[PDB]
């Protein structure tokens, strides 16, 4: 279930008949990401799956968060998962709108997360920005910078380092 | 190590005095993967690692048989693994050069496997297409045809499908 990318308090929702979805019920969410990770019985690609905690369910989609057609809603109860498969893992410009899951510099150190202020204190808390997925310790570039994403390193003698993600034309 | 696209008999030599380098003897490649995908202790983002069943090691490497740095020469008692994470998972264009490790139809069905001849037969063997990598079940798009990465389909009713993968700049 880690090679999802986990957005809290998530579901999705289509207005759109026509982009299908099944729908069934379990034990843990890993029940749920395990079997879209295998796309067993699916009348379509599962690229990402709801587990609505409250009725112990899996909800299972042909799209995720950045497919076009689609918006995100709050839900207390509700857990978003993200196949890695369909998450675009290059880059495209000054990677400005990079959401992937890679947490670390080009040096290997793990990044700190953006709501932390420890080791660093620093101003890009979710808060102020938005829509720029400025969560856990993923790499990112907010301010659509030159080097490309980045964050705070987990390291006190380094502040911050660009990370190692290539450009989509490689 | 099933969230890793393996490579038999085969290794990375770096032509760049630069590029770094980890090793450490181990039981077996499962450990080496572990360490890799949890990118942990690693002075570097890991994008591939390479398994020697002879003197029981592993070599993390900053790179993989894509990057620029590299070539691959044989080995008998070596195995490469490269990390689906650095592997654009995402279509240039018509899709020739895909490479990913999607392995699904557009409508869910598992592929047939390239080197196998039920529940269809082909004449898309890889030594028909070399550089074209027809290994396990990956979809592919080895004459480029418009139609995009394709497969054949494990379910006997369907010879063939495409598959739903993302175009990288649209």
Chains 1, 2 share one sequence.
């Not at 620093?122 to 938005?130: K, N, W």
Request: charged content about 30%.
């Amino acid at each position: 279930v880690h090679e999802f990318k986990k957005s809290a308090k998530t579901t999705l929702i289509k207005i759109d008949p026509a982009l299908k979805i099944k729908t069934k019920k379990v034990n843990t969410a890993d029940q749920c990401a395990n079997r879209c990770t295998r796309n067993k019985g699916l009348p379509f690609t599962c690229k990402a799956f709801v587990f609505d905690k409250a009725r112990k369910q899996c909800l299972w989609f042909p799209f995720n968060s950045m497919s076009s057609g689609v918006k995100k809603e709050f839900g207390h109860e509700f857990d978003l998962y993200e196949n890695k498969d369909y998450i675009r893992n290059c880059i495209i410009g000054k990677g400005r709108s990079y959401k992937g899951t890679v947490s670390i510099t080009k040096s290997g150190i793990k990044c700190q997360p953006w709501s932390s202020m420890i080791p660093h204190e620093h101003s890009f808390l979710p808060s102020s920005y938005r829509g720029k997925d400025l969560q856990e310790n993923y790499c990112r570039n907010p301010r659509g910078e030159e080097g490309g994403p980045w964050c705070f390193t987990s390291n006190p003698e380094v502040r911050y380092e660009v990370c190692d993600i290539p450009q989509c034309s490689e």
